[PDB]
Every structure is written in C-alpha cells, then in structure tokens.
Amino acid sequence: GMDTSGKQAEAMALLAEAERKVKNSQSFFSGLFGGSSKIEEACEIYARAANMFKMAKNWSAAGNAFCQAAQLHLQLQSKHDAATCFVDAGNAFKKADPQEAINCLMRAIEIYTDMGRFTIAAKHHISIAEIYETELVDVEKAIAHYEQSADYYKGEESNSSANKCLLKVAGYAAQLEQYQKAIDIYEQVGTSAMDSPLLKYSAKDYFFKAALCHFCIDMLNAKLAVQKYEELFPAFSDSRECKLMKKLLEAHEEQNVDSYTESVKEYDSISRLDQWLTTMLLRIKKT
Amino acid sequence: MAGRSMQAARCPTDELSLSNCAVVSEKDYQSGQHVIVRTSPNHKYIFTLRTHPSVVPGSVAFSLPQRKWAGLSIGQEIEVALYSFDKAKQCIGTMTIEIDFLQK
Structure with a gap:
C-alpha cells in the first residue's frame, strides 16, 4: 500500500537531513563551540528515523539507525543511553539479522556488568542463549550462556530461576551422551524441591528423569538407585513412574523386548510421551 | 596384611566366571590365594x-553371581585383605x- 513507499521516502529524506546535520556539526563546533546541542538533536533524528523504519516493517534500516545513534551517543560519554540504543539495535537485528544482534547484546552486557547490574546481564545472556538455540544447533554455546546466567542468578540470591536454567542445562547435556552432569543436576533439583510446599508435587517427576538417565550406564546401578529414592521419599512409590520402571526392569532382565515394548505402548496410550522420553527409551531399548 | 583399597570390575572372560574366583591382576596378587x-x-x-594379564592393577574383577551375592557395583571402592x-x-x-539352573 501507500505505507511502504511513503514511509520509505520520508524516512530516507529525514535520515539524509540528519546526515547533513551531523556533517555540519563539526563545522559548527569548530567555528563557535556550540557544544553538544547539535549532536543530541542529530541523535534525536536518528532515533525517530529508526522508530519510523520499525513501523515501516524495514527492520534493517531501523537497526542501522539505532546503531548509528548508539555509537554517536557513546562518543558523548553516555554509556547508559548507548547501551539502551544498542539493545534496541540488537532486537532489530534479532528481528532483521541475528549475527549482528549477538555482538550488540554482548556489548550491552559488558556495559551493564561494568556497573555491577547482574540481573540485566543474566537476562541478556538468556536471550543470547535462546537466539543460539532457535536457529543454530550449536548446543555448547547455549550451555555456556545458560551456565553463566545461572551463576549470576545464584549470585543474586534469586532462587527458583537458576533452577530452571540448570534444568535446561541438564536436559541438553543428557542429549550429548554425557549422563553424569544430568544425574547430578536432576537429583540436586529434586532434593531441593522436595521440601518446598508448592513445588513438592512436582519433585517426583525429576527423580524419574534421573533414573532414566541412570539406566544407560548399567542396569545394576539403576535398580539400586530406585531404592535410594524410595526410602527417602516413600510417596514416590505411589506414582506411575515407579511401576513403569519396575516393569521395564523385569522385562529387560530376561531379554523380553516384547514385554518392554508393550508396556511402553500402554503407558504412551494412557498419556502421550515426550520426544526426549521417546528418544531415551529408544536408546535404552537398543541393549 | 592390614588390607588395601581396590576397585571392583567385571570379569574379562567367561570361563573365569565359572570358577567362583575373584579375577585379579598378576601385578598385585597370585593365583591360589584367598582374600x-x-x-x-x-x-x-x-x-x-585368580590372576589374569588382562586385569588392570588396582582393581578386582567379579562375576555376575558374585556381584549379585555381594551387592557390589562396578566402580565402588572396597577393602581387600589377604586371608589364608x-x-x-x-x-x-x-x-x-x-543347585538350580542359572539362566531362565
């Protein structure tokens, strides 16, 4: 419609006017020492142009304008506004081209952590990890970012949020065929959540995962593991997971693949299985 | 003689599992001794x-019946002392x- 062409033309004209203003700013400063009024006004034009490009659905132009404004205002010794503009540019980049958003968010994180504002740095690290996860399958960088964010959250004494980051880290680590970290994280989270009033009802679930992640190593250490949990949390015996584990162990003890498969089918029929659980059960079945 | 720490392991072979002998390395003990x-x-x-060249020093190898009776795990430290x-x-x-058949 008219919006595309009209917004593009008006934004281009305004940006060209801003370019002329910044070009004349040096001459003005040299001839009269006007100060920073010209530079601040040019930054205002750049911000307005970036916003207009954002409304015009042209993400790249908005990101470029945000970067220009951020750089100019950082030259003015204002690190806070520079970080804000860089965050906007990174979002536009994550909304236009993500690779640039990675470095923009890294710079914003550095600026913020320079002052000791750890919560914002942790949130930005989580955002970067999410960016890595969505497009690429480079799990290692996501694990590093999640570990950094969880460490920051733990250092801020903000519990119930680092737990989720550690759960994500353990779940992704269990995918790479490295089970020790997953077992440790799962057991720690389960024992921590056992005592909470609200979280108590979920605790059981965590244990089950560990048991599955404990079954690949060797069957002997899985059986015993179950015992260690049941004595500590007797109510675990009530959940369906214990019965399923016992039936699977009995089926496997005699190479009875068919009984194991039938029990898995029945449990899936009652409640649909997750891709993670499906993959892990398939891996266990290979033996 | 006072006892030493050692790591549990699995039997390198199948025949050794049929003699109820702790399969060990020649570098630690000698065949015929009891512990x-x-x-x-x-x-x-x-x-x-019962020594065997394939056993790593610092570990005893146990058969499935032996581990089941002893409730041992592959990796746990144990204290083994010579017993004459x-x-x-x-x-x-x-x-x-x-006596009853092992495999079902």
Whole structure:
C-alpha cells in the first residue's frame, strides 16, 4: 500500500537531513563551540528515523539507525543511553539479522556488568542463549550462556530461576551422551524441591528423569538407585513412574523386548510421551 | 596384611566366571590365594584370587553371581585383605549346596 513507499521516502529524506546535520556539526563546533546541542538533536533524528523504519516493517534500516545513534551517543560519554540504543539495535537485528544482534547484546552486557547490574546481564545472556538455540544447533554455546546466567542468578540470591536454567542445562547435556552432569543436576533439583510446599508435587517427576538417565550406564546401578529414592521419599512409590520402571526392569532382565515394548505402548496410550522420553527409551531399548 | 583399597570390575572372560574366583591382576596378587572383601563395617565376604594379564592393577574383577551375592557395583571402592585359611578347623569334609539352573 501507500505505507511502504511513503514511509520509505520520508524516512530516507529525514535520515539524509540528519546526515547533513551531523556533517555540519563539526563545522559548527569548530567555528563557535556550540557544544553538544547539535549532536543530541542529530541523535534525536536518528532515533525517530529508526522508530519510523520499525513501523515501516524495514527492520534493517531501523537497526542501522539505532546503531548509528548508539555509537554517536557513546562518543558523548553516555554509556547508559548507548547501551539502551544498542539493545534496541540488537532486537532489530534479532528481528532483521541475528549475527549482528549477538555482538550488540554482548556489548550491552559488558556495559551493564561494568556497573555491577547482574540481573540485566543474566537476562541478556538468556536471550543470547535462546537466539543460539532457535536457529543454530550449536548446543555448547547455549550451555555456556545458560551456565553463566545461572551463576549470576545464584549470585543474586534469586532462587527458583537458576533452577530452571540448570534444568535446561541438564536436559541438553543428557542429549550429548554425557549422563553424569544430568544425574547430578536432576537429583540436586529434586532434593531441593522436595521440601518446598508448592513445588513438592512436582519433585517426583525429576527423580524419574534421573533414573532414566541412570539406566544407560548399567542396569545394576539403576535398580539400586530406585531404592535410594524410595526410602527417602516413600510417596514416590505411589506414582506411575515407579511401576513403569519396575516393569521395564523385569522385562529387560530376561531379554523380553516384547514385554518392554508393550508396556511402553500402554503407558504412551494412557498419556502421550515426550520426544526426549521417546528418544531415551529408544536408546535404552537398543541393549 | 592390614588390607588395601581396590576397585571392583567385571570379569574379562567367561570361563573365569565359572570358577567362583575373584579375577585379579598378576601385578598385585597370585593365583591360589584367598582374600576377604570388606564394604561395610558388618559385611565380610571371602573370594578366591585368580590372576589374569588382562586385569588392570588396582582393581578386582567379579562375576555376575558374585556381584549379585555381594551387592557390589562396578566402580565402588572396597577393602581387600589377604586371608589364608588355616587347615585345622575349616577343611571341608561334607558340604551341601542348593543347585538350580542359572539362566531362565
């Protein structure tokens, strides 16, 4: 419609006017020492142009304008506004081209952590990890970012949020065929959540995962593991997971693949299985 | 003689599993010796040593029946001490065993 062409033309004209203003700013400063009024006004034009490009659905132009404004205002010794503009540019980049958003968010994180504002740095690290996860399958960088964010959250004494980051880290680590970290994280989270009033009802679930992640190593250490949990949390015996584990162990003890498969089918029929659980059960079945 | 720490392991072969002898390395003990294994302050079991070149030093290898009876895990540390039977009170003359097929 008219919006595309009209917004593009008006934004281009305004940006060209801003370019002329910044070009004349040096001459003005040299001839009269006007100060920073010209530079601040040019930054205002750049911000307005970036916003207009954002409304015009042209993400790249908005990101470029945000970067220009951020750089100019950082030259003015204002690190806070520079970080804000860089965050906007990174979002536009994550909304236009993500690779640039990675470095923009890294710079914003550095600026913020320079002052000791750890919560914002942790949130930005989580955002970067999410960016890595969505497009690429480079799990290692996501694990590093999640570990950094969880460490920051733990250092801020903000519990119930680092737990989720550690759960994500353990779940992704269990995918790479490295089970020790997953077992440790799962057991720690389960024992921590056992005592909470609200979280108590979920605790059981965590244990089950560990048991599955404990079954690949060797069957002997899985059986015993179950015992260690049941004595500590007797109510675990009530959940369906214990019965399923016992039936699977009995089926496997005699190479009875068919009984194991039938029990898995029945449990899936009652409640649909997750891709993670499906993959892990398939891996266990290979033996 | 006071006992030494050692790591549990799996039997390198199948034939050795059929003799009820703790499969060990030649660099630690010698075949024919008997040892007492300790895991808890109230569990004291006994095994027959049998050296084999394929056993890594610092570990004993146990068969599936042996591990099941002893409730041992592959990796846990144990305290093994030499045990020399005195041929004056434990020389078997008449013994009885309950025998049943292993595999179902």
